[PDB]
Design a protein around this ligand. Sequence first.
Ligand SMILES: CN(C)Cc1ccc(C#N)cc1
Length: 284
Amino acid sequence: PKSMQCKVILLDGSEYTCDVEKRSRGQVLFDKVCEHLNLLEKDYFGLTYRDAENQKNWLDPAKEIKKQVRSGAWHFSFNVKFYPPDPAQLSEDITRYYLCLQLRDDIVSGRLPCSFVTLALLGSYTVQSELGDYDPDECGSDYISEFRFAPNHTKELEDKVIELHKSHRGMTPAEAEMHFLENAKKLSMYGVDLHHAKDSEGVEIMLGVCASGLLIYRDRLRINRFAWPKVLKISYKRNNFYIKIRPGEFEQFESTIGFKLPNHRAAKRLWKVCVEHHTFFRLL
Ligand SMILES: CN(C)Cc1ccc(C#N)cc1
């Protein structure tokens, strides 16, 4: 029975290696990674891989791994797929821990923009969880943490992390991770998956996929939002993506809104993530 080596980058930056049978469905690999992580609340997570166009794709757990990675390496990342709007309602501290690890990468990477003060507050909770109580022996006036807090580090940010860290004495790791999440969940780009697109006029926009629906970002003052319950049908055709909106009260007709994506693969990828969000957040 022939097996393929899988390499999975974990949220702590380490690499998990295992073997699966070459005809294995994605769920097989996911279940092994989740067992390695001691993770029971698995529904919020998934594996990503890079396609031949180097685009991030979710590994479909119902489909053969070989039919998704195709010509590419069996190399994957473990990631948050569905960002819970209220992390306090998760049943296990370890779920909140992996969510914190994902959000730290969202922040450092610039995917999750954040004010100075929120960067410093999130950093201070990470330091409290991982090192415990502030110690002045491991931090003089010139201290720079090993922890990555932001897409661009400044001395002023390091100073502010330490000032807030001092305020958290006695705080336990689950308590600090909960505080981290209570702040992170309020950021305007929390759990927003962004897709470059053009509107039916050719104007460049972003489409954001998240718990609260499909968001359209246009010119700054011009942004729209379609809550999932309002969306009856999601479809794609060639380079185009379509949402069918419920008729408004007393309106005779449904309305169909169309967008242009970079290529057919990008339209199909946006369709699949929208359908998956629509199903998940309908049930959660
Ligand atoms: C770090 N390398 C040894 C293998 C690798 C490369 C890329 C990904 C992804 N996704 C996972 C694993």
